[PDB]
Structures are given as C-alpha cells and as structure tokens.
Amino acid sequence: SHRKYEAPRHGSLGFLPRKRAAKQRGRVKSFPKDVKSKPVALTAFLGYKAGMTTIVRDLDRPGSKMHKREVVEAATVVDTPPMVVVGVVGYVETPRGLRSLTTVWAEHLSEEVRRRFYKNWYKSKKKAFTKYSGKYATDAKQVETELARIKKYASVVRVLAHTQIKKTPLSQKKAHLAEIQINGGSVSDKVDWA
Amino acid sequence: MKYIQTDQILDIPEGVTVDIKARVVKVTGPRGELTKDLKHIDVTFNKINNRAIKITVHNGDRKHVAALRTVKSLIANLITGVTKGYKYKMRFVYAHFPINVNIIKKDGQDYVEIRNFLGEKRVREVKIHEGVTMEISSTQKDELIVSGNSLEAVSQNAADIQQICRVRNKDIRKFLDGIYVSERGTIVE
Amino acid sequence: SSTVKAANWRFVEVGRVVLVDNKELATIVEIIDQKRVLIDGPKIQRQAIALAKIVLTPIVLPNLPRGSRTATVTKKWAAADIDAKWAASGWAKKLANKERRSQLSDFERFQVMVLKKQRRFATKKALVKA
Amino acid sequence: AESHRLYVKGKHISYQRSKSVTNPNVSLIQIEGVASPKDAKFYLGKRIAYVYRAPKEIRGSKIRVIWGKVTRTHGNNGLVRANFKKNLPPKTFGASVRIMLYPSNI
Amino acid sequence: SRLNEYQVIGRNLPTESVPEPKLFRMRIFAPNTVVAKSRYWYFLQKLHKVKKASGEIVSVNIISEAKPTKVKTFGIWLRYESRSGIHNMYKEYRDVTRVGAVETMYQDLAARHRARFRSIHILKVVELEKTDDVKRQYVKQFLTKDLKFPLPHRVQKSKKLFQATAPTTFY
Amino acid sequence: SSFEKVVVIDGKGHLLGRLASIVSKQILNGQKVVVVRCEELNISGEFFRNKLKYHDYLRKATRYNKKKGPFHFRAPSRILYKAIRGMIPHKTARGKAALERLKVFEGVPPPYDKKKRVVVPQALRVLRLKPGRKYTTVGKLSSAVGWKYESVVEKLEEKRKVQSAEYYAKKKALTKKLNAAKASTAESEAAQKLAAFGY
RNA sequence: CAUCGGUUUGGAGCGGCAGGAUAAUGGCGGAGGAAUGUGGCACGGCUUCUGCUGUGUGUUAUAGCCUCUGACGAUACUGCCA
RNA sequence: ACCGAACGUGAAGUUAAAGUGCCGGAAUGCACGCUCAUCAGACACCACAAAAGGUGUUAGUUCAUCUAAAUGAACUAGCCCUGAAAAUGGAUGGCGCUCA
RNA sequence: CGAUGAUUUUUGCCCUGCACAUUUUAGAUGGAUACGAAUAAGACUUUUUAGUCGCUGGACCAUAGCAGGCUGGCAACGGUGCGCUUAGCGGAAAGGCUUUGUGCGCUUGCCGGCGGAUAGCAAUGUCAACAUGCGCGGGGAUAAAUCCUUUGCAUACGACUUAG
Numbered sequence A: 001s002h003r004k005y006e007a008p009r010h011g012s013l014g015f016l017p018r019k020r021a022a023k024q025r026g027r028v029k030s031f032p033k034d035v036k037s038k039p040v041a042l043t044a045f046l047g048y049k050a051g052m053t054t055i056v057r058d059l060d061r062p063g064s065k066m067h068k069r070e071v072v073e074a075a076t077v078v079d080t081p082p083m084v085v086v087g088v089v090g091y092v093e094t095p096r097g098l099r100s101l102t103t104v105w106a107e108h109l110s111e112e113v114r115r116r117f118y119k120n121w122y123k124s125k126k127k128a129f130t131k132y133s134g135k136y137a138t139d140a141k142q143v144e145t146e147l148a149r150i151k152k153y154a155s156v157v158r159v160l161a162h163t164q165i166k167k168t169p170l171s172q173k174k175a176h177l178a179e180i181q182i183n184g185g186s187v188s189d190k191v192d193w194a
Numbered sequence B: 001m002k003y004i005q006t007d008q009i010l011d012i013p014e015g016v017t018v019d020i021k022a023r024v025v026k027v028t029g030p031r032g033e034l035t036k037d038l039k040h041i042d043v044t045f046n047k048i049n050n051r052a053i054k055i056t057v058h059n060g061d062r063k064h065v066a067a068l069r070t071v072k073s074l075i076a077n078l079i080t081g082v083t084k085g086y087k088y089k090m091r092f093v094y095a096h097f098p099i100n101v102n103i104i105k106k107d108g109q110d111y112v113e114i115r116n117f118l119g120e121k122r123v124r125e126v127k128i129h130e131g132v133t134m135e136i137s138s139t140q141k142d143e144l145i146v147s148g149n150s151l152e153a154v155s156q157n158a159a160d161i162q163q164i165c166r167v168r169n170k171d172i173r174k175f176l177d178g179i180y181v182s183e184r185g186t187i188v189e
Numbered sequence C: 001s002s003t004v005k006a007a008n009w010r011f012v013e014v015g016r017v018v019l020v021d022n023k024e025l026a027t028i029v030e031i032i033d034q035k036r037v038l039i040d041g042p043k044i045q046r047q048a049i050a051l052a053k054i055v056l057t058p059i060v061l062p063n064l065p066r067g068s069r070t071a072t073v074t075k076k077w078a079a080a081d082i083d084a085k086w087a088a089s090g091w092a093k094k095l096a097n098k099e100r101r102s103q104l105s106d107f108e109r110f111q112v113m114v115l116k117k118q119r120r121f122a123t124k125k126a127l128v129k130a
Numbered sequence D: 001a002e003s004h005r006l007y008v009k010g011k012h013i014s015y016q017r018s019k020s021v022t023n024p025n026v027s028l029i030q031i032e033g034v035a036s037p038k039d040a041k042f043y044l045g046k047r048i049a050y051v052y053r054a055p056k057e058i059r060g061s062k063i064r065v066i067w068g069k070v071t072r073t074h075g076n077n078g079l080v081r082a083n084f085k086k087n088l089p090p091k092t093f094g095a096s097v098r099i100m101l102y103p104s105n106i
Numbered sequence E: 001s002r003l004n005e006y007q008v009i010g011r012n013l014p015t016e017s018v019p020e021p022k023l024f025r026m027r028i029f030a031p032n033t034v035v036a037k038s039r040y041w042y043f044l045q046k047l048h049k050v051k052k053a054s055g056e057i058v059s060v061n062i063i064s065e066a067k068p069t070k071v072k073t074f075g076i077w078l079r080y081e082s083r084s085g086i087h088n089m090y091k092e093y094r095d096v097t098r099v100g101a102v103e104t105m106y107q108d109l110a111a112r113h114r115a116r117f118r119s120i121h122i123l124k125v126v127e128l129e130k131t132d133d134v135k136r137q138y139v140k141q142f143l144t145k146d147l148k149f150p151l152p153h154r155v156q157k158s159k160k161l162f163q164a165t166a167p168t169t170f171y
Numbered sequence F: 001s002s003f004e005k006v007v008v009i010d011g012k013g014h015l016l017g018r019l020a021s022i023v024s025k026q027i028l029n030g031q032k033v034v035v036v037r038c039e040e041l042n043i044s045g046e047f048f049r050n051k052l053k054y055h056d057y058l059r060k061a062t063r064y065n066k067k068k069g070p071f072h073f074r075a076p077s078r079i080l081y082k083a084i085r086g087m088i089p090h091k092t093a094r095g096k097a098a099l100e101r102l103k104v105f106e107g108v109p110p111p112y113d114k115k116k117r118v119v120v121p122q123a124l125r126v127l128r129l130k131p132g133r134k135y136t137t138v139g140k141l142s143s144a145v146g147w148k149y150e151s152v153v154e155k156l157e158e159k160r161k162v163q164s165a166e167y168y169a170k171k172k173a174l175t176k177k178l179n180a181a182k183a184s185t186a187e188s189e190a191a192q193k194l195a196a197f198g199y
Numbered sequence G: 001c002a003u004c005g006g007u008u009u010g011g012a013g014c015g016g017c018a019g020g021a022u023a024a025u026g027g028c029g030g031a032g033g034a035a036u037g038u039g040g041c042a043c044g045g046c047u048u049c050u051g052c053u054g055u056g057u058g059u060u061a062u063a064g065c066c067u068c069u070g071a072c073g074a075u076a077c078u079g080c081c082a
Numbered sequence H: 001a002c003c004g005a006a007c008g009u010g011a012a013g014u015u016a017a018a019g020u021g022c023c024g025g026a027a028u029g030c031a032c033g034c035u036c037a038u039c040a041g042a043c044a045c046c047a048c049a050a051a052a053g054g055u056g057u058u059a060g061u062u063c064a065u066c067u068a069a070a071u072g073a074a075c076u077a078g079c080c081c082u083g084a085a086a087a088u089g090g091a092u093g094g095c096g097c098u099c100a
Numbered sequence I: 001c002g003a004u005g006a007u008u009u010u011u012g013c014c015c016u017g018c019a020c021a022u023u024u025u026a027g028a029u030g031g032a033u034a035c036g037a038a039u040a041a042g043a044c045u046u047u048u049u050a051g052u053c054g055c056u057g058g059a060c061c062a063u064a065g066c067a068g069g070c071u072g073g074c075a076a077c078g079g080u081g082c083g084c085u086u087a088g089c090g091g092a093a094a095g096g097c098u099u100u101g102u103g104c105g106c107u108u109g110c111c112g113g114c115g116g117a118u119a120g121c122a123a124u125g126u127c128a129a130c131a132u133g134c135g136c137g138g139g140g141a142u143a144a145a146u147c148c149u150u151u152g153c154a155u156a157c158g159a160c161u162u163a164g
Ligand SMILES: CN[C@@H]1[C@@H](O)[C@@H](O[C@@H]2[C@@H](O)[C@H](O[C@H]3O[C@H]([C@@H](C)O)[C@@H](O)[C@H](O)[C@H]3N)[C@@H](N)C[C@H]2N)OC[C@]1(C)O
Pocket: H039, H084
C-alpha cells in the first residue's frame, strides 16, 4: 500500500557512497575550461585552513533592507604561503580520455617536497631524484628534448607545485604536492611559463 | 504501383546556368549564386539543351514520385531567386502599444530588435540570417522588408520574426498584436 | 553552358545484348514487365527469363524490331557480327583468360613461374634504366 | 622452396548435433576454399590428421596425431563429416586439421 | 511449373433411362492429374446435382500453350472469398503462357488479399489480343512505343565473405 | 573464405546486426577478427527510433542495487560488442575464448592504420537496404546517449586520412613507374609465351 | 593397399526404348490480316533534316509482326531398361 | 495432458513434428508481392483484445463526367496508424532484423 | 589504464652478444597485400561533349635447388639476406614507416659438372613464435617497505594523517 502521507527523501542520493575519502588531500576533478586568448596563469592554489573569525561590512545591494548598512558575517582564514613550482606534465587527447605523456622536473627539489616520496624518511638514504639531477648537470639536453615533446604533442599542460609547509605552524614536515592546470596562451607558452 | 518513368522539365531562362553533379545543384545568375544539396533524394538529371533540364525518377512508387515535383520546384525557386530575388513584407499590428523595431549590430552580427510588444519590458532579438537583408520601409509606416536571394532563408527568417511575437494567456482573437507577413513576392517584379 | 553529369546506365531495351550464366550471349527481344524479358540468340533457346538472372552488356543490336522471331534475330545478329563485338571487349578477354588459366597443367604452371622470373629480371632492369 | 605443404587446411567446427544433444563420434570439418557439396565431394575418403603437441616425449617426440577420414558431405555450404579413430576432444573446436591428398584418385 | 492446364471430361454413369449421358468439359489449373479430377468433381457437384460415385472421368489431357515464346497480356476473371464476404474481380497479367499468368495471379491474390488457393475460383482466362482491351495501367505502361528503362543500383552477389575492394552498384 | 591470421574489417557502412552475426560465427570457428571505425557503423531505421530503443535499454537496471544492473556502454565499439556478445555462448569457456579473438575500435588506431581493411558485402548497408530507407549512424547515436569522444575521434581520423592520402600518392607514383617498365618489356619472348598461358 | 559379399549415399553421369495433340514450339513452304505503321510521302517546332523530332497516310517497300495451314526434324515432360 | 513418436545393448542409412542470420545442426538459398509504425511485426494449444475511426498505402466493385487529358461519387478488403492506462528492470527465449 | 622517482656491497640486481637445454601454446606451416569518398555513382582520355573500364581475390606479390648440398662458366651493374652506419617521419595503443653509405653472402636471368638409394609401398615422421633456466663474453647501478614507538587533521578493530 502507498505511504499514508508524503514526505521528501532523507539525504541526497548524489553523494554516495558515504565512505571515507581515498586521500586526505582533496583532488580537483575538473579545471576551468581553457581560453587561449587570456594571459598564462594558474587555476588553483593550495593552502591550510587556520580558523574562522567575524568581520563587519557595509552591504551594497539596492533594494535590500540592509542596503548601505553594517552587517556581521562569519569568515574563514586560509593560511597560504607561496607555492614552489617543481615540474610540468603534458596531457594528450585520446579516444579513451586524457593521457599523460611525460613529466619533467626541476633540477633541485627542497627537502620538504622530497620528504613526500618517503614513508620512513629518517631510515632512508634520501636517493629520490638524485640520478634525475644528473640529467641537468651534463648539458640539460635531455630535459629540453622532453619539454619539446610536451610542446609538440600536449593539449593540456599542468604544473607540479608544492606547499612550503614549514612556514606554517604545522608539525608535519612533508609538503603537499599537486598538479595545477595552466590556462591561457598556446601550449608552447604554457611550457615556457612552467 | 511503381510507375516505369516519371519526368519533369526545368526551364532555365536566358541569363542563368545550372551545374548539377552528384545531386548538388549550383545555380548562377545575375544576382549571385545559390547551391542546394539533393543527396537525400534518388533522382537523375539530363540536359535537354541550354534552356531545359529533364528530372527523372525510374520505377518509383507514389511517395518517391511525389518527391520529383518537389525537386523541380526547389530548383526553380533557386533560379527565380538568383534572377528576380525574393522579398517578403511584414506589417506591425497593434491596438495600443506601438511596436519598436530596429536593426542593430551586436558583435558584428545583424539582429532584429523588437521593443514594447504589448507593453512588455522584455526585448526580443531575432538573428538576421546570412544572405538576408532587413529594412524598415520609408514609404509605408510600420513595415519591415525582408529581402534576399534564397526564398527558404527569407521566408524562415520572416517566420522567426512572426513567431517571436506571439501573445500569451490572452484571447488571440481579441489581442491580434503582432508582426505578420503581408506580401510575398520578388524584388524585381 | 549548363553541364549536368548524366548517368551512364545500361538500358533494358530491344536489341540489348546480355550474358546468360556467364557463358552465352543473347539479345532482348521484348519486355514483359519490370522484372522479365524475352531473350533469343543464335546459341541459346528463345525463352522468357528474369532480368536478375542475366547480365546486361554495353553492346546493342541496332534496329531490332520488337518481337522479332528467331530467324530475324539470327539474320540481324550475323549481319551485325555481335560475336566479334563481344570478343573484342575487355570483359570477354578477361573471361577467356580465366578460362585459359583454369586449363593449365602442373607443368604449364611451372613454366609460367619460370617465364615470369625472366620477365621480372628484364622488367627490373628497365625499371632502373628509366 | 619455402612452402612444403602437401595437405589441405581444415578446421574442426563441431560435432554432429541437434539443438541440445551432441554426437562426439562424428565431427564437422571445414575444408579451406570449399563452398559447395560438389567441391566437397572431391575430398570424400581422404584421410585427416589432427596434429598436436604434448608435454611428454614418446620415441623422443612431443608430436602426436589423431587419424580420421572424410565420410560424407554436411549441409549445403561444403562442410564435411569426418570419423576419427578417437573422437576429437571438444577443446579443439576451432583448431586446425590436415586433410591429406591420399588415398588419391587423381 | 507449379501448375498445368488440363481438360477434364466426365459424364454420369449410364443407366436405363439415359443410355448416353451428356459429356461435360472443364479447363482446370492443377499441380497434377489427381488434383485436376478432384477440382472437376468439386465444380460439377456445385454446378449440377451430381456426385463422384454416380459419375466417371472420361479423359484428362494437358492443354499446352499455343505460342510459348510469344509475349501476351492476359485478363483473368476471378471469384474469391475474403475474411468478410465473397467478391468478383478482374486482373491483368503479362506472360508467355496461360499457366504462368495463373501462377502469378495466385501469388498476387495471396500477397494483396491473403487469398489462399482454396478461396479462389478461376472464372475465365483470356488472351487480350488488342491493346485497347488492356484496362489496367499497371500492365498498360509496358505497351508503349520504344519502351526502355535502366536498372539502377545493381547489387552483385559475392561468393566470399570478405571483399578486398569497395562496393559498387553501377549498371 | 580462406583462413587468415587476422581479418581486419572496416566498420564503415556495415549494418550492426548482420555484421555481428557474421563476426560471431567467424570468431567461434577460430578466426581472429578486428573491427575498426565502429562509429561509422549503421543501424536501419531512423535516428529517433534507435535513440528511443537505446533509452528503453537504459531503463533496465537492478532495482535493489544499480551497481549490479546491466551496464549500458555508450561507445560505438561497445554497442557492436554488445550485439556480438548476444550472439556468443559467452558464459562458457569456449565462448570466452571466442570473444578473446575479437577486437573493436573507434577510429583506426595503430597498428591497423597501415594494414589492409576488408568489407563484408552480406552486411553492407548500401548493398542491403532498399534505396529509400532511413538509417542511423552509430557514432551519432553514441554521442546522443553519453559517448564523449566524437570530436577527438573525428580530429584523429582527419589526421590519419591526410597521412594515408600521402601514402597513396607515393604508391600510385611507384605503380605508374612499374607499369611503364612492364610496358617497355612487352612483346618479348617471355611476354608472348606468358600470354599463351593466359598470363 | 587389392578384391569380394551385405547395407547405403552420390555424379553436370552416359546410352537405348515408349507415350503425349504419335508434345506444343521453332525452322522451312503456302494463304490471310492488322498496328505500339518500317520504307515512302505530306505537314510542322526545333536540329546549319549533325540517332532532329513530332503528327498523319497506308499494309513491305530500305524493318518486321500476328493468324491459319503443309510436309519433314527435334526438344521438354513422364515412364521403362533382368 | 499439445505435435511427432512410445523405449532391450549397439553400427550405418532415412525421416516425423519442428526448423535452417548468430546463440544452434541446417540457406544471410531461389521467387512474386505487401508493409515503415515518435507503443511495427514475427508460428497451432498459448500465455488475449472490441465497438468504432484514418485523404497512410495497395488491389478490387459499381456508377458518372470528358477533344462537341483524364476526372467525379459510392463502396469492398489487405498491410499500416488511432481506439490500447499499473504498479522492482525485462522479455517474438535472447541478440538483433526493415527489397527482413 | 598512464606518467614519474628510487630500486639492496648482496655476490644479490639491471642491460646486452652468443651457445646449450626445459616448460608453455583456444591451435604457424609462403605473405594480415594500408587512400578517401560516392553508390540515382566513381575513374581515365580528349574535353566537359563523347569514348572506354569494372560485371569479383580462380587477383597481387612470392614461388625451381640435400627443408634446398658442393663446384664451374656466360650475360648483366640489376634483384635479394644479414650486419655496422646515415637522415627524416610517426604519440590514438607512436614501438613502426622510410632513408644514406658500407662489409660478408645468395641469385633460378642463361648454360654446365658432381651428390641423394635401404626411411624399404604410407605412418606429423619431428624444421614455429613466445617464455624460462643454465654455461661463457661484455658492460652498469649500489634501495626501500612493514612491525615497533609517536600523533589526532583519523579511528570499533584493521585502516588513515603525522614524527622518529
Ligand atoms: C488482422 N487482424 C488483426 C490482428 O492481426 C491484430 O491486429 C494488430 C493490432 O491489434 C495492432 O494494433 C494494436 O495493438 C498495438 C500493440 C499493443 O500491439 C497498439 O500499439 C495499437 O495502438 C493497437 N491498435 C497492430 N499494430 C498490428 C495488428 N496486426 O488484432 C486483431 C485484428 C485487428 O483483427
């Protein structure tokens, strides 16, 4: 028999499953659509949630009852020290979706981002990226060939960047590394900016 | 019943040429050039001479044969549009509120703008199709003139204007306001 | 001028020469309906047949009256030498060459291979010389 | 030369069967290049070999054979029926067999 | 080839009242002689009050076409039974024999009217000798001067499953 | 009719179900098949009708848990795959081994862009349908029901066609030169003697 | 592998004989006829009569067709062959 | 429980009813038509459909008007369309099929 | 499904030239032989007029030699295998398509000389790619993860975020 009385569903069926997130760092599912005619720029930035506070403002909404009047509003502080660019990734269109072609890294990586590649940093020999660094030292010609690859074939260019977590009060020493998409300009301009 | 053969004759006047190849018709005349794709119909063509063309359906049923006079009329409209041109005229009809009509160029694109239709604050903008020219008549009040080489584009674009001005939630027998086609003809009568 | 590309179909019509069973020639004497024609020829039997069972050829017997009897067909056919017209076409030559190739013995196929070898030697020489 | 073949290529298609019941004692065989019963009748009585490889050497060889013979034609498309000394195992549905040219009548 | 035309001649068995009973003939379109005699008795039992047991078949003979390689137009008069009633109709066919036209008629009534063989009586089959006698435009259109027509869109039947060249439908 | 190592079918202009039945019997009998350009396949019937049919397919889903239901694949090669799998005893080991002999692709990816492609006349739309009948292109239908890569495939196919046309121009020039060379050596002793053999 | 005996499925099988309207046709010979009327001829709108073309007339002409029929000769179909 | 056929253990041959695009042994076989459906249709028992409509298309019947280039009326019955609304997602057995 | 970092001072690991040997195989046995598009259309020629072609791949390429041996000559300056080397192109899954020069062969384009037997009148009468292992040669590189303690951005327990 039918429900005796009607009522809306409890909860949304669009946020299923209600499971634990796969990673603590939240990933950007989709980036803003690229506009070639704009200047080359980053589309995202990583920070650390510090807390909340209260502010006072004058409202500017004509027709509102609070127009030209003070309002009190909650607000959130995000601790955002500058990020460090350490690499670049090129993506090619395929009939199966975006596929990463190659990854190119900077010559020097700070200890806080290199800690990201370790589960037991204190017991390791710290070998991460030590042979890669020699790909620059000779004449960097291999690095430039990889970047030329990205210019020739990629349609989407994202930069690799990490937070400077040691400028925050956090006791965590591992930095957070993320891909941030470069929008604006040609692919060649994107690679040069990276 | 599959009539063994049906034929129609295209009359091409002294100042036009008709090039047909793989059911693509290209009609050049003094006023320009028009082209129509007929790949969706199974027909064949023969050049009788420079003034006539035979259009033929072999072993066709009732509907296929019905699609032969249609082809003749479409190509004949191409001819008469590239010779005489096509002009439709629209009269602005209203009881109380005048209908403000303007031809504008937003983003390099010609638009017909209709203002104050039945006193509404909404502004209606209808895109002007390529190859079609609109014009406010300076010899008849409250009249828009729609002209071009292609009868299809001209008539569809006049229809777009007519359809954008439909009265809602009122007795349309009483509220006759609109922009209506009042004359269909050629530029060169 | 106008220049409309017309079709270059072969027509079902009296005098049209057809192949029968990929082997024998005939000519359409009369049309029964959309699907069927009466055919006759010097080396067949006069018969009504379905157009789907025969193959139209580009050759036409000229000025064959509708309904011609076997004697008339034979006389017109001999006068026009339809067989010579057919045997000169590439279609007939390809059929004849297929028939010839299917008659080879093992030893004849061996000879074909060696002759092709000599042919190929000369052809490559002329190819570089080009 | 570089081709040494003296047999005609074939495939093991199926057993004789109705919709639900199979008969392993008769195999259906497709002979390459054969499209009609008339062409297939050339091969009636020809010997068939299914040649396969086995883990264990016998007489120093890992190659083993099941011998049969073409018995009659099957259907209208040139398939044939075959009888093997031992029924071809059903895992060989789709495998290749070798139609000999002997006993020859040419 | 499905059918043959027969004459079937029969009479009542002789009695004392009627020593020489009248011979009757029917033209029958049948697959074989057994069906031909069956049809003869069927029609004789309808038309007259006679039975098979009190009569006899006198002769059964194939009637061959007079001119089997002359193109003709036939008119056929028919009585057939529909799902709903009983109707008369007249149709025209082009053929070189009467049996060919009758076979085409049976196919045509099966196709357009769902009339099975058991539902049809053949009233009369006549070779139309003057072009003015041809009444139906679906056969009349093949009786015009210098009739010629192409056969557009030819489909070639392939022996192989896979073709290495692109299809063509020219002809 | 010959046994090939791999048969590569150009899917352009083939009717879905007829090609599917032919391919199913081919792979069941031990022949490896690759079908390319599945977005160029055809289905008889107008587009709107086949779209309605696909939406009736989408309507079917396991009520108590949609994740268990039928999985409605949208890409054209998967539409052909669904047609083929329906004609295979895919729940047996032999059916699985037959399906492993099959590959289906949008476009013509490597290595098949440099290999010969064939057609199947018993399934060709231009040869099967009556000339006036309406039909659907599977690529349009897929895009209407959620396939995301119509434009990527179109761009890549244009690039492949440019490269293939340049290939063909070179092959045609070489063939013309070879024909001249063989014409220079006609009426030779070997040429005449081969002509006596039908060659 | 060969030959035999039993059962059985085939071949583009080959050949002899019989029947029928002692096939009907066709081919050949004779008489009669007409039209979806060939040649000829006349009237034309278009082709420098460069299949021009259409319409009329009438009956083999610079094509043919249809009906009836005379004497020969086959074939199809059906059946038989110890 | 219908159709076919009734059963010792086997070899070979041939069938019944039912079938021969794939699932599935056997033809994308030969042939004449009809049908296009924004709820087509698809095999007895059997897994239903009516009264009633259609200027969709096809073939027929009977009248009538026309050079003093064909058309007008009434009707018949085929396939197709409307009439045709139920509850988990789903069943011509499935795939799929449109000169099938 | 992809990109990328680092991959054990153990005699463990990577790459590479061989040689011998073992397992495996949904099933080698000359060659998977590359335009695109239309189909009431294509192509070629002269020209946009006409002619011709297809009407199946029963095609094309390859194909002779102890499963292909050993030796001689003629004509050609070609064809072809392997091997170093050169230049370009290919990112859809490129992993392939070409190309320069150069050393060792082969050539059935033509003509010779020598060998095959007895596996007995057939018996797959054994000739493949892929993988792995072991022996030599050549080079090359020299880590981490988990437990444990810790944290509380986490938590029923596992798991997770941290630090050592
Ligand atoms: C020839 N006799 C027909 C018989 O075949 C059948 O007719 C169906 C008819 O009912 C169908 O039509 C009906 O049924 C369909 C659907 C439910 O099947 C509905 O969509 C449709 O609206 C309805 N009118 C029609 N589409 C086909 C005819 N053969 O039903 C009985 C009948 C009308 O007498």
